mmCIF file of C-alpha atoms in Angstrom:
data_model
loop_
_atom_site.group_PDB
_atom_site.id
_atom_site.type_symbol
_atom_site.label_atom_id
_atom_site.label_comp_id
_atom_site.label_asym_id
_atom_site.label_seq_id
_atom_site.Cartn_x
_atom_site.Cartn_y
_atom_site.Cartn_z
ATOM 1 C CA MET A 1 85.978 99.050 97.136
ATOM 2 C CA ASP A 2 87.759 96.197 98.911
ATOM 3 C CA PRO A 3 86.301 92.659 98.762
ATOM 4 C CA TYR A 4 87.102 91.882 102.411
ATOM 5 C CA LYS A 5 87.177 95.283 104.156
ATOM 6 C CA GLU A 6 83.446 95.027 104.863
ATOM 7 C CA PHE A 7 83.970 91.603 106.480
ATOM 8 C CA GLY A 8 86.886 92.696 108.679
ATOM 9 C CA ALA A 9 89.643 90.923 106.772
ATOM 10 C CA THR A 10 91.824 92.404 104.036
ATOM 11 C CA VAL A 11 93.324 91.061 100.825
ATOM 12 C CA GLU A 12 96.670 91.743 102.513
ATOM 13 C CA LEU A 13 95.718 89.264 105.245
ATOM 14 C CA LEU A 14 94.559 86.516 102.876
ATOM 15 C CA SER A 15 97.538 86.972 100.540
ATOM 16 C CA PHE A 16 100.047 85.753 103.136
ATOM 17 C CA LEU A 17 98.511 82.295 103.221
ATOM 18 C CA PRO A 18 100.106 80.024 100.593
ATOM 19 C CA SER A 19 98.519 80.263 97.159
ATOM 20 C CA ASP A 20 98.300 76.471 96.831
ATOM 21 C CA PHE A 21 96.449 76.255 100.166
ATOM 22 C CA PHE A 22 93.078 77.294 98.756
ATOM 23 C CA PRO A 23 91.072 74.414 97.230
ATOM 24 C CA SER A 24 90.231 74.655 93.534
ATOM 25 C CA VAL A 25 87.218 76.574 92.215
ATOM 26 C CA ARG A 26 85.395 73.347 91.341
ATOM 27 C CA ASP A 27 85.683 72.072 94.920
ATOM 28 C CA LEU A 28 84.440 75.374 96.353
ATOM 29 C CA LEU A 29 81.474 75.415 93.967
ATOM 30 C CA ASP A 30 80.671 71.804 94.873
ATOM 31 C CA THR A 31 80.717 72.659 98.584
ATOM 32 C CA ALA A 32 78.524 75.718 98.006
ATOM 33 C CA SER A 33 75.999 73.743 95.950
ATOM 34 C CA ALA A 34 75.930 70.945 98.529
ATOM 35 C CA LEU A 35 75.551 73.208 101.561
ATOM 36 C CA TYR A 36 73.941 76.595 100.805
ATOM 37 C CA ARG A 37 72.208 76.113 97.446
ATOM 38 C CA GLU A 38 68.759 76.856 98.885
ATOM 39 C CA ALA A 39 70.114 79.867 100.783
ATOM 40 C CA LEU A 40 71.778 81.267 97.656
ATOM 41 C CA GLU A 41 68.616 80.661 95.614
ATOM 42 C CA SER A 42 66.431 82.239 98.309
ATOM 43 C CA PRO A 43 64.755 85.517 97.258
ATOM 44 C CA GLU A 44 65.938 87.197 100.469
ATOM 45 C CA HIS A 45 69.610 87.631 101.320
ATOM 46 C CA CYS A 46 69.659 87.261 105.157
ATOM 47 C CA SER A 47 73.415 88.004 105.191
ATOM 48 C CA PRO A 48 76.111 90.029 103.403
ATOM 49 C CA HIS A 49 77.986 86.759 102.843
ATOM 50 C CA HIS A 50 75.165 85.265 100.773
ATOM 51 C CA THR A 51 74.943 88.383 98.593
ATOM 52 C CA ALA A 52 78.717 88.472 98.106
ATOM 53 C CA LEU A 53 78.794 84.757 97.264
ATOM 54 C CA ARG A 54 75.967 85.203 94.749
ATOM 55 C CA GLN A 55 77.802 88.075 93.063
ATOM 56 C CA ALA A 56 81.064 86.108 93.037
ATOM 57 C CA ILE A 57 79.413 83.033 91.503
ATOM 58 C CA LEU A 58 77.674 85.115 88.832
ATOM 59 C CA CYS A 59 80.916 86.933 87.990
ATOM 60 C CA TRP A 60 82.811 83.634 87.816
ATOM 61 C CA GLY A 61 80.186 82.266 85.441
ATOM 62 C CA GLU A 62 80.506 85.380 83.284
ATOM 63 C CA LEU A 63 84.304 85.041 83.218
ATOM 64 C CA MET A 64 84.048 81.356 82.281
ATOM 65 C CA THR A 65 81.616 82.228 79.483
ATOM 66 C CA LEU A 66 84.013 84.908 78.223
ATOM 67 C CA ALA A 67 86.918 82.445 78.358
ATOM 68 C CA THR A 68 84.904 79.887 76.383
ATOM 69 C CA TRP A 69 84.007 82.575 73.834
ATOM 70 C CA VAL A 70 87.685 83.504 73.466
ATOM 71 C CA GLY A 71 88.638 79.844 73.095
ATOM 72 C CA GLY A 72 86.050 79.537 70.344
ATOM 73 C CA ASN A 73 87.770 82.391 68.520
ATOM 74 C CA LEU A 74 90.699 81.463 66.262
ATOM 75 C CA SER A 75 97.132 81.010 71.675
ATOM 76 C CA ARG A 76 93.522 80.930 72.860
ATOM 77 C CA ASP A 77 94.442 77.999 75.130
ATOM 78 C CA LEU A 78 96.952 80.217 76.963
ATOM 79 C CA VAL A 79 94.437 82.856 78.058
ATOM 80 C CA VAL A 80 92.605 80.096 79.947
ATOM 81 C CA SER A 81 95.856 79.385 81.795
ATOM 82 C CA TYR A 82 96.149 83.138 82.352
ATOM 83 C CA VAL A 83 92.718 83.455 83.980
ATOM 84 C CA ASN A 84 93.156 80.480 86.317
ATOM 85 C CA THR A 85 96.263 82.002 87.950
ATOM 86 C CA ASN A 86 95.566 85.759 87.906
ATOM 87 C CA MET A 87 91.779 85.857 88.273
ATOM 88 C CA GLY A 88 91.503 82.194 89.246
ATOM 89 C CA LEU A 89 93.486 82.688 92.449
ATOM 90 C CA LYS A 90 91.474 85.795 93.361
ATOM 91 C CA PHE A 91 88.115 84.076 92.856
ATOM 92 C CA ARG A 92 89.423 81.003 94.686
ATOM 93 C CA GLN A 93 90.438 83.096 97.702
ATOM 94 C CA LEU A 94 87.163 85.037 97.723
ATOM 95 C CA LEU A 95 84.991 81.920 97.461
ATOM 96 C CA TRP A 96 87.008 80.091 100.122
ATOM 97 C CA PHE A 97 86.754 83.065 102.482
ATOM 98 C CA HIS A 98 83.004 83.462 102.018
ATOM 99 C CA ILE A 99 82.218 79.737 102.256
ATOM 100 C CA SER A 100 84.373 79.350 105.371
ATOM 101 C CA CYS A 101 82.770 82.420 106.957
ATOM 102 C CA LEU A 102 79.315 81.005 106.229
ATOM 103 C CA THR A 103 80.296 77.631 107.700
ATOM 104 C CA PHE A 104 82.334 78.492 110.807
ATOM 105 C CA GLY A 105 81.732 82.233 111.211
ATOM 106 C CA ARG A 106 83.766 85.328 110.416
ATOM 107 C CA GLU A 107 85.797 85.280 113.635
ATOM 108 C CA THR A 108 86.812 81.603 113.551
ATOM 109 C CA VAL A 109 87.972 82.267 109.984
ATOM 110 C CA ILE A 110 90.011 85.332 111.011
ATOM 111 C CA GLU A 111 91.823 83.546 113.830
ATOM 112 C CA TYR A 112 92.289 80.502 111.573
ATOM 113 C CA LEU A 113 93.916 82.751 108.966
ATOM 114 C CA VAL A 114 96.290 84.412 111.422
ATOM 115 C CA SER A 115 97.111 81.154 113.233
ATOM 116 C CA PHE A 116 97.798 79.314 109.974
ATOM 117 C CA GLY A 117 100.031 82.138 108.768
ATOM 118 C CA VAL A 118 101.994 82.085 112.022
ATOM 119 C CA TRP A 119 102.189 78.279 111.868
ATOM 120 C CA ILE A 120 103.397 78.110 108.260
ATOM 121 C CA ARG A 121 105.962 80.813 109.028
ATOM 122 C CA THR A 122 107.101 79.056 112.217
ATOM 123 C CA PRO A 123 110.090 76.678 111.919
ATOM 124 C CA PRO A 124 108.913 73.046 111.987
ATOM 125 C CA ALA A 125 111.008 71.935 114.976
ATOM 126 C CA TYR A 126 109.379 74.406 117.400
ATOM 127 C CA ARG A 127 105.934 74.073 115.804
ATOM 128 C CA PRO A 128 102.843 71.950 116.482
ATOM 129 C CA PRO A 129 103.133 68.767 114.398
ATOM 130 C CA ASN A 130 99.748 69.177 112.673
ATOM 131 C CA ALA A 131 98.626 72.275 110.800
ATOM 132 C CA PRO A 132 95.617 74.190 112.161
ATOM 133 C CA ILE A 133 92.322 72.986 110.705
ATOM 134 C CA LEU A 134 89.010 74.809 110.283
ATOM 135 C CA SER A 135 86.437 72.455 111.796
ATOM 136 C CA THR A 136 84.152 71.863 114.773
ATOM 137 C CA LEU A 137 84.762 69.378 117.572
ATOM 138 C CA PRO A 138 81.994 66.881 118.504
ATOM 139 C CA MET B 1 121.167 99.048 127.165
ATOM 140 C CA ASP B 2 118.770 96.104 127.431
ATOM 141 C CA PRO B 3 115.856 96.141 124.941
ATOM 142 C CA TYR B 4 113.851 93.596 126.954
ATOM 143 C CA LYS B 5 114.558 94.837 130.497
ATOM 144 C CA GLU B 6 111.715 97.335 130.058
ATOM 145 C CA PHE B 7 109.324 94.443 129.319
ATOM 146 C CA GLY B 8 110.608 92.187 132.122
ATOM 147 C CA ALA B 9 112.701 89.800 130.043
ATOM 148 C CA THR B 10 116.483 90.004 129.704
ATOM 149 C CA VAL B 11 119.062 89.332 127.008
ATOM 150 C CA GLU B 12 120.132 86.129 128.772
ATOM 151 C CA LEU B 13 116.523 84.908 128.908
ATOM 152 C CA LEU B 14 116.177 85.143 125.125
ATOM 153 C CA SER B 15 119.743 83.901 124.599
ATOM 154 C CA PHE B 16 118.565 80.395 125.528
ATOM 155 C CA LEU B 17 116.491 80.140 122.354
ATOM 156 C CA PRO B 18 118.485 78.731 119.411
ATOM 157 C CA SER B 19 119.292 80.846 116.379
ATOM 158 C CA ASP B 20 117.170 78.567 114.178
ATOM 159 C CA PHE B 21 114.238 78.978 116.589
ATOM 160 C CA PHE B 22 113.256 82.344 115.134
ATOM 161 C CA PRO B 23 111.850 82.553 111.592
ATOM 162 C CA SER B 24 113.305 84.713 108.847
ATOM 163 C CA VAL B 25 113.135 88.478 109.276
ATOM 164 C CA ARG B 26 111.053 88.663 106.100
ATOM 165 C CA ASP B 27 108.596 86.206 107.662
ATOM 166 C CA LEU B 28 108.331 88.323 110.816
ATOM 167 C CA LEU B 29 107.793 91.491 108.773
ATOM 168 C CA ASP B 30 105.047 89.744 106.798
ATOM 169 C CA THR B 31 103.461 88.554 110.052
ATOM 170 C CA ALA B 32 103.525 92.084 111.475
ATOM 171 C CA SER B 33 102.029 93.550 108.294
ATOM 172 C CA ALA B 34 99.302 90.893 108.224
ATOM 173 C CA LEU B 35 98.370 91.197 111.891
ATOM 174 C CA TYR B 36 99.008 94.675 113.335
ATOM 175 C CA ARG B 37 99.486 96.951 110.309
ATOM 176 C CA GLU B 38 96.473 99.142 111.096
ATOM 177 C CA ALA B 39 97.870 99.523 114.622
ATOM 178 C CA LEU B 40 101.428 100.305 113.506
ATOM 179 C CA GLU B 41 100.481 103.309 111.355
ATOM 180 C CA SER B 42 97.793 104.274 113.865
ATOM 181 C CA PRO B 43 98.248 107.846 115.166
ATOM 182 C CA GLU B 44 98.598 106.578 118.759
ATOM 183 C CA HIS B 45 100.908 103.861 120.039
ATOM 184 C CA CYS B 46 98.373 101.888 122.177
ATOM 185 C CA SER B 47 101.300 99.970 123.805
ATOM 186 C CA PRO B 48 105.086 100.031 124.310
ATOM 187 C CA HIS B 49 105.242 96.919 122.121
ATOM 188 C CA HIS B 50 103.815 98.840 119.161
ATOM 189 C CA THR B 51 106.404 101.624 119.461
ATOM 190 C CA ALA B 52 109.253 99.141 119.845
ATOM 191 C CA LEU B 53 108.039 97.160 116.824
ATOM 192 C CA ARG B 54 107.663 100.331 114.744
ATOM 193 C CA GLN B 55 111.194 101.534 115.368
ATOM 194 C CA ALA B 56 112.525 97.994 114.944
ATOM 195 C CA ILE B 57 110.932 98.001 111.482
ATOM 196 C CA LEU B 58 112.464 101.407 110.729
ATOM 197 C CA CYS B 59 115.892 100.211 111.880
ATOM 198 C CA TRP B 60 115.681 97.031 109.805
ATOM 199 C CA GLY B 61 114.636 99.036 106.755
ATOM 200 C CA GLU B 62 117.602 101.356 107.242
ATOM 201 C CA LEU B 63 119.916 98.345 107.599
ATOM 202 C CA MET B 64 118.541 96.889 104.360
ATOM 203 C CA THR B 65 119.073 100.262 102.682
ATOM 204 C CA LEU B 66 122.707 100.186 103.817
ATOM 205 C CA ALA B 67 123.070 96.582 102.630
ATOM 206 C CA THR B 68 121.693 97.465 99.193
ATOM 207 C CA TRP B 69 124.047 100.454 99.007
ATOM 208 C CA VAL B 70 127.097 98.372 99.943
ATOM 209 C CA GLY B 71 126.051 95.607 97.551
ATOM 210 C CA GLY B 72 126.413 97.923 94.565
ATOM 211 C CA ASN B 73 129.707 99.343 95.854
ATOM 212 C CA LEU B 74 132.703 97.891 94.009
ATOM 213 C CA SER B 75 134.716 91.704 100.272
ATOM 214 C CA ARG B 76 131.465 93.585 99.694
ATOM 215 C CA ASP B 77 129.652 90.242 99.417
ATOM 216 C CA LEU B 78 130.741 89.404 102.985
ATOM 217 C CA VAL B 79 129.119 92.392 104.721
ATOM 218 C CA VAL B 80 125.781 91.607 103.047
ATOM 219 C CA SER B 81 125.880 88.181 104.695
ATOM 220 C CA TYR B 82 127.265 89.578 107.967
ATOM 221 C CA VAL B 83 124.346 91.978 108.461
ATOM 222 C CA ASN B 84 122.050 88.944 108.229
ATOM 223 C CA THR B 85 124.388 86.759 110.312
ATOM 224 C CA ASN B 86 124.371 88.349 113.782
ATOM 225 C CA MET B 87 122.586 91.705 113.539
ATOM 226 C CA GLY B 88 119.871 90.007 111.506
ATOM 227 C CA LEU B 89 119.676 87.404 114.268
ATOM 228 C CA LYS B 90 119.197 90.078 116.936
ATOM 229 C CA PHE B 91 116.629 91.884 114.788
ATOM 230 C CA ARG B 92 114.585 88.735 114.177
ATOM 231 C CA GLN B 93 114.824 87.856 117.878
ATOM 232 C CA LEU B 94 113.464 91.288 118.815
ATOM 233 C CA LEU B 95 110.712 91.099 116.190
ATOM 234 C CA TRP B 96 109.701 87.624 117.372
ATOM 235 C CA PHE B 97 109.638 88.772 120.996
ATOM 236 C CA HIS B 98 107.470 91.802 120.256
ATOM 237 C CA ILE B 99 105.079 90.017 117.877
ATOM 238 C CA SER B 100 104.649 87.125 120.319
ATOM 239 C CA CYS B 101 104.040 89.569 123.171
ATOM 240 C CA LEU B 102 101.388 91.303 121.065
ATOM 241 C CA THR B 103 99.743 88.001 120.094
ATOM 242 C CA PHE B 104 99.870 85.727 123.153
ATOM 243 C CA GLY B 105 100.550 88.392 125.775
ATOM 244 C CA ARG B 106 103.780 89.500 127.418
ATOM 245 C CA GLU B 107 103.403 87.237 130.455
ATOM 246 C CA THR B 108 102.654 84.098 128.426
ATOM 247 C CA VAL B 109 105.827 84.831 126.465
ATOM 248 C CA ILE B 110 107.759 85.169 129.741
ATOM 249 C CA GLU B 111 106.679 81.771 131.072
ATOM 250 C CA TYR B 112 107.215 80.253 127.619
ATOM 251 C CA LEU B 113 110.759 81.640 127.620
ATOM 252 C CA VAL B 114 111.540 80.271 131.079
ATOM 253 C CA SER B 115 110.065 76.864 130.189
ATOM 254 C CA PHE B 116 112.043 76.792 126.936
ATOM 255 C CA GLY B 117 115.213 77.658 128.840
ATOM 256 C CA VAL B 118 114.516 74.810 131.258
ATOM 257 C CA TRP B 119 113.966 72.492 128.285
ATOM 258 C CA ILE B 120 117.200 73.551 126.555
ATOM 259 C CA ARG B 121 119.279 73.242 129.727
ATOM 260 C CA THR B 122 118.091 69.640 130.064
ATOM 261 C CA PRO B 123 120.411 67.175 128.301
ATOM 262 C CA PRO B 124 118.736 65.496 125.314
ATOM 263 C CA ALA B 125 118.819 62.026 126.901
ATOM 264 C CA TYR B 126 116.551 63.081 129.791
ATOM 265 C CA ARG B 127 114.548 65.562 127.695
ATOM 266 C CA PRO B 128 111.133 65.312 126.012
ATOM 267 C CA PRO B 129 111.567 65.019 122.234
ATOM 268 C CA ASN B 130 109.398 68.048 121.393
ATOM 269 C CA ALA B 131 110.204 71.579 122.517
ATOM 270 C CA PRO B 132 107.490 73.569 124.317
ATOM 271 C CA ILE B 133 104.978 75.271 122.027
ATOM 272 C CA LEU B 134 103.984 78.916 122.474
ATOM 273 C CA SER B 135 100.203 79.362 122.524
ATOM 274 C CA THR B 136 97.376 80.902 124.556
ATOM 275 C CA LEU B 137 94.637 79.417 126.720
ATOM 276 C CA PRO B 138 91.123 80.658 127.613
ATOM 277 C CA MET C 1 104.970 103.915 108.756
ATOM 278 C CA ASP C 2 106.168 107.200 110.250
ATOM 279 C CA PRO C 3 108.400 107.154 113.366
ATOM 280 C CA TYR C 4 107.019 110.453 114.708
ATOM 281 C CA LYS C 5 103.364 109.835 113.804
ATOM 282 C CA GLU C 6 102.628 108.646 117.349
ATOM 283 C CA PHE C 7 103.902 111.912 118.845
ATOM 284 C CA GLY C 8 101.880 114.262 116.634
ATOM 285 C CA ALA C 9 104.774 114.956 114.247
ATOM 286 C CA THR C 10 105.576 113.838 110.713
ATOM 287 C CA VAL C 11 108.608 113.748 108.447
ATOM 288 C CA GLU C 12 107.048 116.696 106.611
ATOM 289 C CA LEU C 13 106.893 118.668 109.870
ATOM 290 C CA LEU C 14 110.538 117.943 110.707
ATOM 291 C CA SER C 15 111.587 118.709 107.118
ATOM 292 C CA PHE C 16 111.343 122.393 108.071
ATOM 293 C CA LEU C 17 114.535 122.074 110.105
ATOM 294 C CA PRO C 18 117.682 121.787 107.946
ATOM 295 C CA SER C 19 119.802 118.651 107.996
ATOM 296 C CA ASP C 20 122.833 120.465 109.425
ATOM 297 C CA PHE C 21 120.768 122.035 112.227
ATOM 298 C CA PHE C 22 120.816 118.897 114.366
ATOM 299 C CA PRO C 23 123.831 118.335 116.639
ATOM 300 C CA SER C 24 126.216 115.437 116.211
ATOM 301 C CA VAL C 25 125.156 111.992 117.399
ATOM 302 C CA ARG C 26 127.895 112.048 120.043
ATOM 303 C CA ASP C 27 126.486 115.251 121.554
ATOM 304 C CA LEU C 28 122.968 113.800 121.703
ATOM 305 C CA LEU C 29 124.240 110.577 123.278
ATOM 306 C CA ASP C 30 126.211 112.582 125.848
ATOM 307 C CA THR C 31 123.108 114.629 126.674
ATOM 308 C CA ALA C 32 121.036 111.458 127.070
ATOM 309 C CA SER C 33 123.656 109.825 129.300
ATOM 310 C CA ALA C 34 123.989 112.953 131.443
ATOM 311 C CA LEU C 35 120.248 113.509 131.860
ATOM 312 C CA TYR C 36 118.091 110.381 131.505
ATOM 313 C CA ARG C 37 120.502 107.460 131.933
ATOM 314 C CA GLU C 38 118.822 106.212 135.117
ATOM 315 C CA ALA C 39 115.450 106.414 133.361
ATOM 316 C CA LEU C 40 116.663 104.615 130.229
ATOM 317 C CA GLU C 41 118.131 101.776 132.288
ATOM 318 C CA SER C 42 115.138 101.885 134.642
ATOM 319 C CA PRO C 43 113.106 98.640 134.512
ATOM 320 C CA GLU C 44 109.874 100.572 133.875
ATOM 321 C CA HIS C 45 109.371 102.427 130.604
ATOM 322 C CA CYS C 46 107.991 105.624 132.225
ATOM 323 C CA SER C 47 107.124 106.988 128.745
ATOM 324 C CA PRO C 48 106.864 106.089 125.052
ATOM 325 C CA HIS C 49 109.787 108.474 124.512
ATOM 326 C CA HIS C 50 112.066 106.430 126.774
ATOM 327 C CA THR C 51 111.310 103.257 124.806
ATOM 328 C CA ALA C 52 111.895 105.147 121.559
ATOM 329 C CA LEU C 53 115.235 106.478 122.812
ATOM 330 C CA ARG C 54 116.287 103.010 123.989
ATOM 331 C CA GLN C 55 115.479 101.492 120.597
ATOM 332 C CA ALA C 56 117.313 104.284 118.768
ATOM 333 C CA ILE C 57 120.388 103.976 121.000
ATOM 334 C CA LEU C 58 120.538 100.206 120.516
ATOM 335 C CA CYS C 59 120.157 100.644 116.750
ATOM 336 C CA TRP C 60 122.970 103.206 116.704
ATOM 337 C CA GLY C 61 125.166 100.846 118.715
ATOM 338 C CA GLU C 62 124.468 98.062 116.226
ATOM 339 C CA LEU C 63 125.365 100.365 113.331
ATOM 340 C CA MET C 64 128.581 101.381 115.101
ATOM 341 C CA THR C 65 129.440 97.702 115.537
ATOM 342 C CA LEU C 66 128.846 97.320 111.792
ATOM 343 C CA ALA C 67 131.144 100.283 111.113
ATOM 344 C CA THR C 68 133.902 98.922 113.355
ATOM 345 C CA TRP C 69 133.597 95.482 111.746
ATOM 346 C CA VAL C 70 133.834 96.872 108.210
ATOM 347 C CA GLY C 71 136.728 99.138 109.196
ATOM 348 C CA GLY C 72 138.676 96.275 110.735
ATOM 349 C CA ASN C 73 137.812 93.961 107.853
ATOM 350 C CA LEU C 74 139.073 94.557 104.304
ATOM 351 C CA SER C 75 136.555 101.887 100.650
ATOM 352 C CA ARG C 76 136.891 100.018 103.942
ATOM 353 C CA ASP C 77 136.583 103.341 105.797
ATOM 354 C CA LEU C 78 134.236 105.013 103.303
ATOM 355 C CA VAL C 79 131.235 103.141 104.735
ATOM 356 C CA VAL C 80 131.767 104.720 108.161
ATOM 357 C CA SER C 81 131.517 108.104 106.436
ATOM 358 C CA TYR C 82 128.516 107.033 104.346
ATOM 359 C CA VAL C 83 126.502 105.894 107.375
ATOM 360 C CA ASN C 84 126.874 109.449 108.688
ATOM 361 C CA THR C 85 126.169 111.066 105.301
ATOM 362 C CA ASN C 86 122.510 109.993 105.159
ATOM 363 C CA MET C 87 121.625 107.474 107.881
ATOM 364 C CA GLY C 88 123.498 109.425 110.541
ATOM 365 C CA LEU C 89 121.271 112.389 109.711
ATOM 366 C CA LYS C 90 118.154 110.311 110.389
ATOM 367 C CA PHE C 91 119.543 108.945 113.653
ATOM 368 C CA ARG C 92 120.577 112.359 114.971
ATOM 369 C CA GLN C 93 117.214 113.803 113.891
ATOM 370 C CA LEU C 94 115.269 111.126 115.770
ATOM 371 C CA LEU C 95 117.544 111.321 118.821
ATOM 372 C CA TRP C 96 117.200 115.111 118.924
ATOM 373 C CA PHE C 97 113.419 114.837 118.626
ATOM 374 C CA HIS C 98 113.059 112.360 121.480
ATOM 375 C CA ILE C 99 115.645 114.002 123.756
ATOM 376 C CA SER C 100 114.004 117.405 123.266
ATOM 377 C CA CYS C 101 110.559 115.910 123.891
ATOM 378 C CA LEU C 102 111.852 114.428 127.147
ATOM 379 C CA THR C 103 113.531 117.698 128.148
ATOM 380 C CA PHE C 104 110.821 120.221 127.264
ATOM 381 C CA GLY C 105 107.684 118.315 126.281
ATOM 382 C CA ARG C 106 106.151 116.900 123.113
ATOM 383 C CA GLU C 107 103.950 119.936 122.461
ATOM 384 C CA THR C 108 106.765 122.383 123.232
ATOM 385 C CA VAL C 109 108.850 120.652 120.568
ATOM 386 C CA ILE C 110 105.870 120.770 118.184
ATOM 387 C CA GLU C 111 105.507 124.542 118.323
ATOM 388 C CA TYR C 112 109.304 124.856 118.308
ATOM 389 C CA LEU C 113 109.263 123.001 114.983
ATOM 390 C CA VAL C 114 106.488 125.275 113.705
ATOM 391 C CA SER C 115 108.309 128.434 114.816
ATOM 392 C CA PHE C 116 111.582 127.237 113.291
ATOM 393 C CA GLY C 117 109.799 126.594 110.001
ATOM 394 C CA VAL C 118 108.348 130.107 110.140
ATOM 395 C CA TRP C 119 111.802 131.540 110.878
ATOM 396 C CA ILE C 120 113.478 129.572 108.082
ATOM 397 C CA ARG C 121 110.874 130.575 105.489
ATOM 398 C CA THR C 122 111.379 134.277 106.243
ATOM 399 C CA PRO C 123 113.700 136.045 103.784
ATOM 400 C CA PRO C 124 117.081 136.959 105.296
ATOM 401 C CA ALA C 125 116.383 140.700 105.035
ATOM 402 C CA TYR C 126 113.521 140.449 107.552
ATOM 403 C CA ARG C 127 114.737 137.291 109.309
ATOM 404 C CA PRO C 128 115.700 137.919 112.960
ATOM 405 C CA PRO C 129 119.449 137.434 113.488
ATOM 406 C CA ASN C 130 118.971 134.734 116.148
ATOM 407 C CA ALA C 131 117.219 131.492 115.256
ATOM 408 C CA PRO C 132 114.576 130.292 117.732
ATOM 409 C CA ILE C 133 116.094 128.343 120.615
ATOM 410 C CA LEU C 134 114.427 125.504 122.512
ATOM 411 C CA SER C 135 114.740 126.211 126.235
ATOM 412 C CA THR C 136 112.665 126.042 129.404
ATOM 413 C CA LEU C 137 110.839 129.160 130.519
ATOM 414 C CA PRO C 138 110.129 130.379 134.089
#
């Protein structure tokens, strides 16, 4: 299984964006709760993105519970710094991808990814002054 | 004898671009892997650009193999920089040309090159502060 | 990333032919110049094989410039032997493949590779004295 192969993208595509680019897990969860809480809590799925987001949120909750359990044991404050960079980055990327695809669509996200990669790899002098942004014009 | 004459451009047309205009060869390889990987190992070329990019990647890999071999041979620290000095410059120029032709189209790259040459030939006093930006339009 | 994967061949398929079977790079370059020079310098690609041959020839020229630079500078002349020990084999293999495909056809080269593998597997006692030869038939 590949988390993004179903949705066109690949982990290889998302990995070339800077790691610090993705907003923290708390921010992504806040955006999800603000925007699609009723959709995620709906009995019916109506999209692969909603199902994937539900599974990701449940797995993140399970991992946080396991981390809290480990911290309760006994050192244990270094495994929490381990999870936020190894698994934390992966969950951050997955949640950002799914939330952005729900908001702006899969395509817009794919071209935003490729354009932002090209931009960040382009030398600044021969580059647009402002980084590409995922948004909608009035 | 001319890599670009097949695609319409010429060596003098791309010679107008500064050396610092092109990104690092590693950046171009990452861009190619992110964008057109599934096309590059596809069992059919689908374009002359794909074939040229494929054998450019093979050539650069062979050059890096030679550089690694000569690095461990014991001056020898000068050739490792030389391969990235001028031959690396030509390789990154070719990779940029082919990737840009695949992304924005060959023609768009041709007019961007001629506009950039016009911009460079202009003295800085009577020249717009920002160089032309390569992009595509609907 | 296989150079021959576009043309129905693989490195495994060409591994049937021994390394010393291929002619010297100078002979292949002379054959190309004698036969398809006008096509290689033609503005239109006319084939994937012509683009492949152009890329290979330019890469070989770049490597020869490297060899001349390292010979003039400074094992100063051991690198020019080393490039032929392993990398020269790859370049002459690829040049032979593309020149033969231009001369006889891609498929003709494919069954020539198959027949040469069959001939080279056969024990010498029952192996025909003459190896299969790639030539045009009336």
